[PDB]
Amino acid sequence: ELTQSRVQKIWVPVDHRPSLPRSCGSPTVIVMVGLPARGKTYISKKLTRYLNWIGVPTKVFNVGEYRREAVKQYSSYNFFRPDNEEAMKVRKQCALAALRDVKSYLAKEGGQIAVFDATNTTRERRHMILHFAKENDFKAFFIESVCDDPTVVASNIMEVKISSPDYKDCNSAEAMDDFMKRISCYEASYQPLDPDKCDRDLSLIKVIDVGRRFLVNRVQDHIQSRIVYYLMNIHVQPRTIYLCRHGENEHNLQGRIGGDSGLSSRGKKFASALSKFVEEQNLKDLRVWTSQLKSTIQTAEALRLPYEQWKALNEIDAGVCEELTYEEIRDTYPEEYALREQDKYYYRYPTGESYQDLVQRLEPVIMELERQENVLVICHQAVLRCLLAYFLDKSAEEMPYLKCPLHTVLKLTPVAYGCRVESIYLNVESVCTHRERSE
Amino acid sequence: ELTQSRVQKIWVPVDHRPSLPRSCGSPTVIVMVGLPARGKTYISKKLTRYLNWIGVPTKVFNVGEYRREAVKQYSSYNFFRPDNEEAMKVRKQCALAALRDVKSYLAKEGGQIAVFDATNTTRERRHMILHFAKENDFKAFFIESVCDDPTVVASNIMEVKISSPDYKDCNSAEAMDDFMKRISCYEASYQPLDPDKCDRDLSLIKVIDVGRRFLVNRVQDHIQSRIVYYLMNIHVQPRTIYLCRHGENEHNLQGRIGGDSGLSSRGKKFASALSKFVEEQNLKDLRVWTSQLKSTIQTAEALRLPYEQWKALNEIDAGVCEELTYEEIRDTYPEEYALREQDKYYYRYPTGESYQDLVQRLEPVIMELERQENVLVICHQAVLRCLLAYFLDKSAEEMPYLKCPLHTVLKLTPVAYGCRVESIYLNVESVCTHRERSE
């Protein structure tokens, strides 16, 4: 005898708890390794953003931030000299303090992956972190980022270093000059991971030649396997992603959800405007993805560009609620209506989906977007929120409420360690969002 | 203006062909590299089986088979001596003949990946294959399998070599003895791929230390990226996979398709029998996967083992046909009924799925099954056919017709280069398959 949970709709055995109900109440440390300005922090933040979005709780422990709080105002690379005994001691205390927080996150706060982001360039420091992992029952996975192209190091410095709080009192050439001296502090004592000898037994990936060569050693589980796959499909060349919904469609005009209706006459004006907009972006090659529902495909046909249909991009399935208006939902399914409002990410429609299901189904879209250059994705409201949450690092709880009005393009471009979003409304009227009607 | 295709249900622009209708009517060579008995052929066949099942047409060109047809009866390793000028010449003609067939497969027969399976141990031979790829516009991807553990080489020989047609006239110790001499023929001239120098520019993966270490260089596209991910998640340790359907359920008794009904009283007897059967298999640790539909979960609850629910394992979605009987389908949707019978793999139910959709949605299940040891999967008829087609290398056209009766376990175990299937019927009656009723 089983019962279906109210919110997620999962069949679970009836828990006829005895009259004294009893209640029951292996984590990984990813260790970044590498010289400064090699992308460690960029990898840490973007990996975490991916892991959290697919539902693995992950947190970055950036030792550099523990050092910023402990010292206040960075003045120069002198702080990083190997002969600076006081600073060496502060640096090691910053690392140990970050490790206490790692311990707490993984063993007490429900975290599953802690990304320990520091140079970690000596065997002796990595040996200590492994002792920490062994003593707490954490697994350890090392990601070493290796970069021997001065062009790329210089560009990293310009993109994320010179504008750091460290270089507050500094202009660009002097910041750049200081950082280069900082880097050279680490060179004498740097000991790269060596999987053929001393590091034979560590689980690790070395990212080399600007994400071009990988060495992967002893992947241990499912999550490490996903990490490596991810790291092997990201790249740093700047590009643009555009996201929008299909033009207004006939179910939009009747306030009916889901279905597979066609563009209204304003939806087709949007589709023309979108065509005009794409042309003035003036982009080299632009890939166009749609879902398999009619109104996104009509919208792409207005563009006269080749496009590709993905069933993974189709709107969230409303199950028994498909093609009902919001009032017919409230009046036939008051219980269901109210539960959804209470827990909108986890809620699943009967015989339908939740935002949480959407996430799993969009995972290959996200993986392929990482591999692309310029792409325009024409999709649907919930799909769009779910993709936007991944690029803007929004949590599960905020994802179902992100603003995505009709006839509005979202333009995502890389800056610093993330995505900037610009909204471009294409000046064609539509019925409003459901949120705006309510208030 | 768009129209929905009859079979797959894809929105496509009306093709109002002019009165003289005109009709329009980059491939990859995967190059295996390595000493004999290193798993090249096992990798070639299993990669091809994966690629074809996810819908990439792929074919193995095993030069060893071209050599078997050209020479007839292998007598000894003498054939492989580097001083055998006649045999060297035959071997090179076998390779060139396989390359002509590769050319034809990729450029004329619609193939997309040709796996060129031969030792290819010298730079000079790999340079020629690259010339072949460059001259035909094929991309080239190299997979080198490196094995330095005599235990594993010996075991490969026992598992697939001694029983070869080559060793027809031979017993085991002498076959093993001959093969070792064969291997040592290749050692003086063997030149491993070297990505840090001479092979910097090749796209390749070296599989080392029994699938434990990888070196990956210059992945170029989507398909290569999927290959590498796959190769990094397969392993050779023997295990068992069991597949079955849920016990008979109440929609089974009424001949109604889909839905989410519970076990009938015979379904619950099956579930007990399944519990008894699992216990007598006497397996170390056994993972149990179910779908999120009730009757598979009830079936697993009879086992008193921990299980994991996957929404990817849910039955194919019948769309408007959900919960109809086969006669109500025939009588309300005669057009739809008949199309499905005509093209059962590609056919999609209105607002529902096809076997082809099932495949994409099961891809992560297949990837995780590769990583597992002993696993029992309790699922549904179409899901089961789709997984069985992957393990038994059945084509898309045969997949929807594979026999999967109720109350029957399929036990899959590794032999030689594939999976043996044994059927174990657990002696509990159920309504019959729909195929059996019809005839």
Side-chain angles (χ1 to χ4, degrees):
Chain A
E1 156 152 289
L2 301 179
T3 186
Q4 205 168 35
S5 78
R6 301 128 307 296
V7 172
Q8 298 190 263
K9 299 310 185 286
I10 292 298
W11 293 100
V12 296
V14 308
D15 193 340
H16 294 336
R17 275 143 179 284
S19 49
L20 291 46
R22 260 195 175 92
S23 98
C24 228
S26 198
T28 303
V29 184
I30 296 187
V31 182
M32 308 304 307
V33 176
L35 292 175
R38 263 52 183 182
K40 296 184 305 291
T41 293
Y42 174 89
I43 289 161
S44 307
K45 289 182 176 276
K46 165 151 197 180
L47 187 53
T48 297
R49 176 159 74 62
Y50 175 71
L51 289 170
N52 284 129
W53 169 82
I54 67 182
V56 182
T58 304
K59 181 164 178 188
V60 175
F61 298 78
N62 180 159
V63 175
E65 289 157 31
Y66 285 70
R67 157 193 53 90
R68 273 181 289 268
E69 249 93 291
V71 155
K72 289 115 176 294
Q73 232 36 253
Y74 180 83
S75 48
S76 85
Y77 78 95
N78 290 272
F79 182 81
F80 293 95
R81 294 156 61 164
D83 67 346
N84 198 323
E85 134 214 284
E86 188 184 39
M88 286 294 274
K89 163 175 198 184
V90 168
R91 285 165 65 205
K92 195 194 187 180
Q93 291 159 0
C94 289
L96 287 171
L99 288 171
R100 96 146 122 32
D101 290 345
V102 171
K103 187 191 173 143
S104 168
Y105 175 69
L106 294 181
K108 298 172 154 52
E109 301 163 11
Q112 179 62 30
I113 308 262
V115 182
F116 189 69
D117 176 22
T119 58
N120 294 313
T121 51
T122 67
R123 288 177 182 157
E124 162 278 315
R125 179 52 55 79
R126 291 179 310 258
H127 182 87
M128 157 184 112
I129 299 177
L130 242 10
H131 196 72
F132 166 84
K134 175 75 36 222
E135 87 195 326
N136 290 285
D137 256 85
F138 299 155
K139 310 186 197 189
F141 186 66
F142 293 79
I143 297 173
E144 174 167 28
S145 171
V146 177
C147 181
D148 281 319
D149 187 338
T151 293
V152 169
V153 170
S155 173
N156 296 162
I157 292 162
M158 299 302 294
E159 182 82 0
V160 295
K161 307 294 190 190
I162 63 173
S163 46
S164 166
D166 284 353
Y167 294 104
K168 195 162 135 59
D169 303 15
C170 257
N171 75 55
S172 293
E174 70 203 1
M176 161 66 84
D177 191 76
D178 175 276
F179 205 87
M180 296 308 282
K181 280 164 193 188
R182 187 161 153 187
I183 287 159
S184 68
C185 292
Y186 285 83
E187 286 176 322
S189 56
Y190 175 35
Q191 300 177 296
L193 296 168
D194 178 32
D196 293 329
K197 311 199 212 301
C198 147
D199 308 304
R200 193 179 321 107
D201 295 314
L202 308 184
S203 300
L204 62 94
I205 171 175
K206 289 210 182 208
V207 186
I208 294 135
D209 194 62
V210 205
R212 260 148 44 211
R213 194 181 311 148
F214 310 85
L215 210 171
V216 179
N217 203 231
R218 300 185 187 233
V219 168
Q220 304 177 66
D221 64 10
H222 170 244
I223 200 62
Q224 296 187 8
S225 169
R226 294 299 292 278
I227 289 165
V228 162
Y229 177 46
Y230 186 74
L231 294 171
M232 319 188 32
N233 289 285
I234 62 176
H235 71 260
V236 295
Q237 276 214 291
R239 40 102 165 238
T240 303
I241 296 168
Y242 306 79
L243 305 177
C244 68
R245 289 163 74 185
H246 51 80
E248 187 180 70
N249 68 29
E250 321 228 72
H251 279 22
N252 292 147
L253 288 170
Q254 317 181 264
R256 210 166 286 270
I257 69 178
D260 192 11
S261 67
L263 295 188
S264 68
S265 61
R266 293 143 145 186
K268 308 176 171 204
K269 300 168 197 128
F270 171 68
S272 302
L274 182 60
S275 172
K276 186 125 169 309
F277 168 86
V278 164
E279 177 181 319
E280 67 218 3
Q281 301 292 299
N282 210 298
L283 287 161
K284 199 181 278 176
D285 284 297
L286 172 63
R287 305 299 148 86
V288 181
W289 300 351
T290 69
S291 70
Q292 291 185 349
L293 308 175
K294 186 178 195 177
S295 65
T296 66
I297 293 151
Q298 292 181 286
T299 300
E301 278 285 311
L303 311 180
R304 300 170 329 273
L305 294 173
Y307 54 97
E308 186 180 14
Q309 305 184 205
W310 294 66
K311 190 167 196 280
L313 289 164
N314 280 188
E315 188 50 308
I316 186 166
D317 189 331
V320 296
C321 293
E322 278 295 301
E323 305 192 294
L324 261 42
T325 80
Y326 273 124
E327 322 87 57
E328 324 178 298
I329 289 162
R330 211 168 314 115
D331 294 350
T332 322
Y333 298 110
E335 347 94 5
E336 287 304 316
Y337 186 94
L339 295 161
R340 188 172 198 261
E341 302 311 343
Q342 254 262 11
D343 199 5
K344 201 179 172 191
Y345 180 85
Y346 288 108
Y347 172 90
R348 171 185 299 177
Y349 285 99
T351 83
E353 295 172 301
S354 62
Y355 275 78
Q356 189 176 213
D357 302 332
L358 249 192
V359 175
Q360 300 280 294
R361 134 157 109 75
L362 290 164
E363 196 281 340
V365 175
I366 282 316
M367 197 64 65
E368 193 44 40
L369 286 168
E370 289 304 341
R371 298 194 48 80
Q372 298 284 130
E373 275 207 34
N374 305 316
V375 201
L376 160 66
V377 183
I378 301 169
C379 52
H380 310 252
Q381 176 175 244
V383 168
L384 169 54
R385 288 171 168 160
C386 171
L387 296 171
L388 203 54
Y390 162 83
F391 288 110
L392 271 25
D393 190 25
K394 306 294 180 176
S395 70
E397 288 72 32
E398 57 205 353
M399 172 186 314
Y401 300 97
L402 294 175
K403 298 319 206 175
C404 293
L406 285 177
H407 295 353
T408 297
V409 179
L410 301 172
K411 178 179 165 165
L412 306 164
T413 47
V415 356
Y417 294 114
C419 297
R420 169 194 197 205
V421 59
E422 324 156 49
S423 191
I424 309 105
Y425 170 56
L426 304 190
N427 196 33
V428 177
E429 290 281 345
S430 62
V431 313
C432 58
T433 50
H434 175 242
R435 175 136 268 79
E436 179 157 356
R437 237 314 258 174
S438 286
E439 54 172 329
Chain B
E1 156 152 289
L2 301 179
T3 186
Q4 205 168 35
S5 78
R6 301 128 307 296
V7 172
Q8 298 190 263
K9 299 310 185 286
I10 292 298
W11 293 100
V12 296
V14 308
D15 193 340
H16 294 336
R17 275 143 179 284
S19 49
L20 291 46
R22 260 195 175 92
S23 98
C24 228
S26 198
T28 303
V29 184
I30 296 187
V31 182
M32 308 304 307
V33 176
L35 292 175
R38 263 52 183 182
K40 296 184 305 291
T41 293
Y42 174 89
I43 289 161
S44 307
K45 289 182 176 276
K46 165 151 197 180
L47 187 53
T48 297
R49 176 159 74 62
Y50 175 71
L51 289 170
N52 284 129
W53 169 82
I54 67 182
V56 182
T58 304
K59 181 164 178 188
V60 175
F61 298 78
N62 180 159
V63 175
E65 289 157 31
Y66 285 70
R67 157 193 53 90
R68 273 181 289 268
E69 249 93 291
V71 155
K72 289 115 176 294
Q73 232 36 253
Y74 180 83
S75 48
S76 85
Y77 78 95
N78 290 272
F79 182 81
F80 293 95
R81 294 156 61 164
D83 67 346
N84 198 323
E85 134 214 284
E86 188 184 39
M88 286 294 274
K89 163 175 198 184
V90 168
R91 285 165 65 205
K92 195 194 187 180
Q93 291 159 0
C94 289
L96 287 171
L99 288 171
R100 96 146 122 32
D101 290 345
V102 171
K103 187 191 173 143
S104 168
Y105 175 69
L106 294 181
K108 298 172 154 52
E109 301 163 11
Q112 179 62 30
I113 308 262
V115 182
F116 189 69
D117 176 22
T119 58
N120 294 313
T121 51
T122 67
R123 288 177 182 157
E124 162 278 315
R125 179 52 55 79
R126 291 179 310 258
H127 182 87
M128 157 184 112
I129 299 177
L130 242 10
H131 196 72
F132 166 84
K134 175 75 36 222
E135 87 195 326
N136 290 285
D137 256 85
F138 299 155
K139 310 186 197 189
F141 186 66
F142 293 79
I143 297 173
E144 174 167 28
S145 171
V146 177
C147 181
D148 281 319
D149 187 338
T151 293
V152 169
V153 170
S155 173
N156 296 162
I157 292 162
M158 299 302 294
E159 182 82 0
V160 295
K161 307 294 190 190
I162 63 173
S163 46
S164 166
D166 284 353
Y167 294 104
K168 195 162 135 59
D169 303 15
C170 257
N171 75 55
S172 293
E174 69 203 1
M176 161 66 84
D177 191 76
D178 175 276
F179 205 87
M180 296 308 282
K181 280 164 193 188
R182 187 161 153 187
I183 287 159
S184 68
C185 292
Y186 285 83
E187 286 176 322
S189 56
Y190 175 35
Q191 300 177 296
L193 296 169
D194 178 32
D196 293 329
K197 311 199 212 301
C198 147
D199 308 304
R200 193 179 321 107
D201 295 314
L202 308 184
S203 300
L204 62 94
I205 171 175
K206 289 210 182 208
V207 186
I208 294 135
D209 194 62
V210 205
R212 260 148 44 211
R213 194 181 311 148
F214 310 85
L215 210 171
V216 179
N217 203 231
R218 300 185 187 233
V219 168
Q220 304 177 66
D221 64 10
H222 170 244
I223 200 62
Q224 296 187 8
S225 169
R226 294 299 292 278
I227 289 165
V228 162
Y229 177 46
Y230 186 74
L231 294 171
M232 319 188 32
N233 289 285
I234 62 176
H235 71 260
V236 295
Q237 276 214 291
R239 40 102 165 238
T240 303
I241 296 168
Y242 306 79
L243 305 177
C244 68
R245 289 163 74 185
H246 51 80
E248 187 180 70
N249 68 29
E250 321 228 72
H251 279 22
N252 292 147
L253 288 170
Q254 317 181 264
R256 210 166 286 270
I257 69 178
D260 192 11
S261 67
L263 295 188
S264 68
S265 61
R266 293 143 145 186
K268 308 176 171 204
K269 300 168 197 128
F270 171 68
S272 302
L274 182 60
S275 172
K276 186 125 169 309
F277 168 86
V278 164
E279 177 181 319
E280 67 218 3
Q281 301 292 299
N282 210 298
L283 287 161
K284 199 181 278 176
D285 284 297
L286 172 63
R287 305 299 148 86
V288 181
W289 300 351
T290 69
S291 70
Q292 291 185 349
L293 308 175
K294 186 178 195 177
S295 65
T296 66
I297 293 151
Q298 292 181 286
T299 300
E301 278 285 311
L303 311 180
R304 300 170 329 273
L305 294 173
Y307 54 97
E308 186 180 14
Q309 305 184 205
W310 294 66
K311 190 167 196 280
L313 289 164
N314 280 188
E315 188 50 308
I316 186 166
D317 189 331
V320 296
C321 293
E322 278 295 301
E323 305 192 294
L324 261 42
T325 80
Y326 273 124
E327 322 87 57
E328 324 178 298
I329 289 162
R330 211 168 314 115
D331 294 350
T332 322
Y333 298 110
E335 347 94 5
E336 287 304 316
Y337 186 94
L339 295 161
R340 188 172 198 261
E341 302 311 343
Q342 254 262 11
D343 199 5
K344 201 179 172 191
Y345 180 85
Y346 288 108
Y347 172 90
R348 171 185 299 177
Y349 285 99
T351 83
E353 295 172 301
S354 62
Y355 275 78
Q356 189 176 213
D357 302 332
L358 249 192
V359 175
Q360 300 280 294
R361 134 157 109 75
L362 290 164
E363 196 281 340
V365 175
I366 282 316
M367 197 64 65
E368 193 44 40
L369 286 168
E370 289 304 341
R371 298 194 48 80
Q372 298 284 130
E373 275 207 34
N374 305 316
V375 201
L376 160 66
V377 183
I378 301 169
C379 52
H380 310 252
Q381 176 175 244
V383 168
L384 169 54
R385 288 171 168 160
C386 171
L387 296 171
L388 203 54
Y390 162 83
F391 288 110
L392 271 25
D393 190 25
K394 306 294 180 176
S395 70
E397 288 72 32
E398 57 205 353
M399 172 186 314
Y401 300 97
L402 294 175
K403 298 319 206 175
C404 293
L406 285 177
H407 295 353
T408 297
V409 179
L410 301 172
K411 178 179 165 165
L412 306 164
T413 47
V415 356
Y417 294 114
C419 297
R420 169 194 197 205
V421 59
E422 324 156 49
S423 191
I424 309 105
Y425 170 56
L426 304 190
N427 196 33
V428 177
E429 290 281 345
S430 62
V431 313
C432 58
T433 50
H434 175 242
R435 175 136 268 79
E436 179 157 356
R437 237 314 258 174
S438 286
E439 54 172 329

